[PDB]
Amino acid sequence: LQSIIKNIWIPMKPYYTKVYQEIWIGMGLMGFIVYKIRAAD
Amino acid sequence: VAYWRQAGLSYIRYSQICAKAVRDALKTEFKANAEKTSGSNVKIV
């Protein structure tokens, strides 16, 4: 998985680690919402 | 912002043109005195 570490994650590291952390909290919220919507159906 | 202000003119030029137009529409009895009492003589160096 070389160039998957370097071309795919080395660029997105400063964002996926520092800037989009609250984005990931919100994405967990959204996943919970979607799971609850699909559960009541 | 009028059209002449977009065209680069200023209100002094607008006023000069409108006053010249008003004087040019004066009847010949007053026209000479009008352009003479308002004619310009200053010149730029």
Binding site: - | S15, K43, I44
Partner: protein, 191 residues
């Protein structure tokens, strides 16, 4: 002689032209850098201390402003003041004018002077015009009247009461009032 007779309506005009700036009480900015200085006089000498006094005031306050850092550029209406001041203040000099005095000064002259004062690219942030206020046949006084730009008349919070005002109408009013004050001084200095 006749100039005193034509000074009455021109004085009423030019004084009603500046009643706003004393009713609105515009103080002008003492902080900005650029500065314009118009000196009104004639071309034909044998008049005594007219041009001498004009030059005194011009160079005096030019030094007074250069001591504060404000860039002052000179305009001379009349060949006498231009020839007197061209010896020492020539780089600080915008433009000068001719044929002032031979014929009685008319509004066309002031309009031309104001046009050339605008079509010169000098972004003057404040100005002053210096003329010879006529009091009686024996005495006159060297006076100066201020000239405000757009940014000081538009930002003055005393102009917040004036309705239907934007930057364009203020620009037009400032240009016409420049022409008006030049005409007032040109009618005052001939007498």
């Amino acid at each position: 002689a006749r100039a005193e007779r034509e000074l009455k309506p021109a004085r009423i005009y030019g004084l009603g032209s500046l009643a706003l700036y004393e009713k609105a009480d515009i103080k002008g900015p003492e902080d900005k850098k650029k500065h314009l200085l118009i000196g009104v006089s004639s071309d034909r000498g044998l008049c005594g201390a007219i041009h001498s006094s004009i030059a005194k005031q011009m160079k005096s306050e030019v030094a007074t402003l250069t001591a504060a850092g404000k860039e002052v550029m000179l305009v001379g209406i009349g060949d006498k003041i231009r020839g007197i001041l061209y010896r020492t203040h020539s780089d600080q000099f915008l433009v000068a004018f001719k044929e002032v005095g031979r014929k009685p000064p008319t509004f066309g002259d002031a309009s031309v002077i104001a046009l050339e004062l605008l079509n010169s690219g000098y972004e003057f942030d404040e100005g002053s015009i210096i003329f010879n206020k006529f009091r009686s046949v024996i005495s006159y006084k060297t006076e100066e009247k201020p000239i405000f730009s757009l940014n000081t008349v538009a930002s003055a919070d005393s102009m917040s009461i004036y309705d239907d005002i934007d930057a364009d109408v203020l620009q037009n009013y400032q240009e016409y009032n420049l022409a008006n004050i030049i005409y007032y001084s040109l009618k005052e200095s001939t007498t």
